[PDB]
Symmetry: C3
Subunit: 259 residues, 3 copies
Amino acid sequence: HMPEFKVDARGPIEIWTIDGESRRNAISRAMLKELGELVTRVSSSRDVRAVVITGAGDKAFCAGADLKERATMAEDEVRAFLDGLRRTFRAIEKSDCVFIAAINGAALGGGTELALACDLRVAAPAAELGLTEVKLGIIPGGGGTQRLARLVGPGRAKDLILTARRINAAEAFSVGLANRLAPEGHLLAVAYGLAESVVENAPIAVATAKHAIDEGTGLELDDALALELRKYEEILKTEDRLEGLRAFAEKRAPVYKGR
Amino acid sequence: HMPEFKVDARGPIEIWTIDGESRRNAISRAMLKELGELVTRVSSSRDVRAVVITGAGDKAFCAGADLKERATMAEDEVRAFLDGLRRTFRAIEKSDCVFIAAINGAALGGGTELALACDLRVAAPAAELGLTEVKLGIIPGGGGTQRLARLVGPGRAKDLILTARRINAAEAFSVGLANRLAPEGHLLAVAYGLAESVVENAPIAVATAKHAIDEGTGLELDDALALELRKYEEILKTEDRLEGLRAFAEKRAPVYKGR
Amino acid sequence: HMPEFKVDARGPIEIWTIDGESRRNAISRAMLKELGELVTRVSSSRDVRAVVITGAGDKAFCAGADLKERATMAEDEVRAFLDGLRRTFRAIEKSDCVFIAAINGAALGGGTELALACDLRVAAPAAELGLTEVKLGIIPGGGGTQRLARLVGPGRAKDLILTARRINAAEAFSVGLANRLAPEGHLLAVAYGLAESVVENAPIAVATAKHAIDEGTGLELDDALALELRKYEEILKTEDRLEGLRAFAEKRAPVYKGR
């Protein structure tokens, strides 16, 4: 039997491919379990500093919850699955590792909410994203309403969520939902280059800045500045910040150890 | 005597036209009274699920407070009028019905604040929006500073409000203030199509998502996610969400009842 | 000896040029001291209503902290310098005077954080902005993470800060980081025209609107609307708002006194 993810590990960067092309890379409980374990692994040390998540094929990044498996699941199993999915999105945000969603096709439902929980997004020409829950009488249940509004603002969020329309790669780039647009056939080359541009920077500094950004939202200005300054004073105590000064003084690339 | 609004009712969608072309569709107390009653009516059941608001003619969406009537109003009457105007904007936001502003011309003052209180905006080629209060020594008094900043961010809000410049349809679309741009002569066709794309979705789900978006702003991430989840668990108790599942299983359009 | 700033005073508008081309207009303690005194001066009356800040030459707006002087400064002197820099950014925000950054070249570090603390930004073709701290193992220490995220949102902020890439003038304009793009050779003409469009408006109204925008961020909607209304009721008590009504009634330009 084949694992839910193909892992292409390249030292400080890994590429995780959802190996589910025939089921539109949907989130089964087994897929979710592997995803959670991968996140826990890269979150437990500073060996891995950026992860690219993508789906197999050219049709689906991730269709969301697996509706075949849903036919085997009672109400309480559905609720426990959605709880685990929310916890996994939050683990991605709280992780010191940076997460890049390489959107190779359609994202819907939980698959869109996965892309929104990532730090950065790259869109192939076939990328599409949708939160279509209101068509079926519910709302996004894995943070999609809040995470979309925080990223594109309330007007664009209402547009997508209340009309339940899909957004294509060009519009996703124009509104900042996609940070990069990749040419035909170069999705993972672009996503990997993005990861390279992150992991040459210091891992605790990247992590701390990531968390400062996310944790400052919803605070008034002075509270948010106080939060940033606590994190600045924390990072000054690291050994890596000294290596940064030494590398700058010695006109060489820094070699950071994650301490 | 003719009413302040022409109402073009089409079942789940209504078009309300401010019938005031000769006075630039300004907000008199009588116009405001009708507006409040219309909002209360569509907010009291789920019969009406989207409303398009527009102004008569091709020059003004809504010029704001009626300055002819202002000459008849004492200070205390001005204050009571602005209080009612604020309450009406808030009623639009709190309503389960979705509100689309079809901007057929210039919006200023309270007319801009009306457009900002709506859920979505469509701009005709002649659409213009301005908050020019600082030219006259005051600031927007119907929520315009907050509602603009929440929609386009602090830099663009400062630009418009501190310079008191008007923004045209093309720029409004580029910065997301207008969700759609309509071709010459097709404003209400575009706005109505937008309304159709909303009202085929489930009304309590649309409403709940609208409120989740608006109520999450200003909260830190975990508080906002907790708020979304309370609303998700609420919507699971509706009958319409079951119709959504049944329609999906039966490969047919859903027929939602608002329960 | 020449002052750290050249001041081109034109009544209600001043242009402050960092006179440091040979050191990339870096922030020494002496530069920072002059900057703080200039801000205190224009913040202490309503004589000056807009200030344009720019750097000498065509290469650097402001490179940030002066690394030559840093070689003479002990750890405690660095900490006191960064504290003063933060206080000066906050003074710019709290000032009733409007601040326009005319970005003539590269901004980095504290120089970028200065531009972000300003109310509005104009970019010359050579404008570049960067927060590259993570390359050296730290994070921005003068509010840059919060001020950038508040202006361009969390996805674009993470992109710039986590990759430590520089953004050019065209992209800065598209994402709203630059409010205006100036043609080759016309930076200060464009920035001055922007200042003129501010200072013909009433100074207490401009100030109050500026503060309403900044102070409302991080509040939930009703708290933010209550804050705006307190400021509206404050501004109604000014003499200038009466001059605004009189000028409008008399079809003439207002002449505001700052009271």
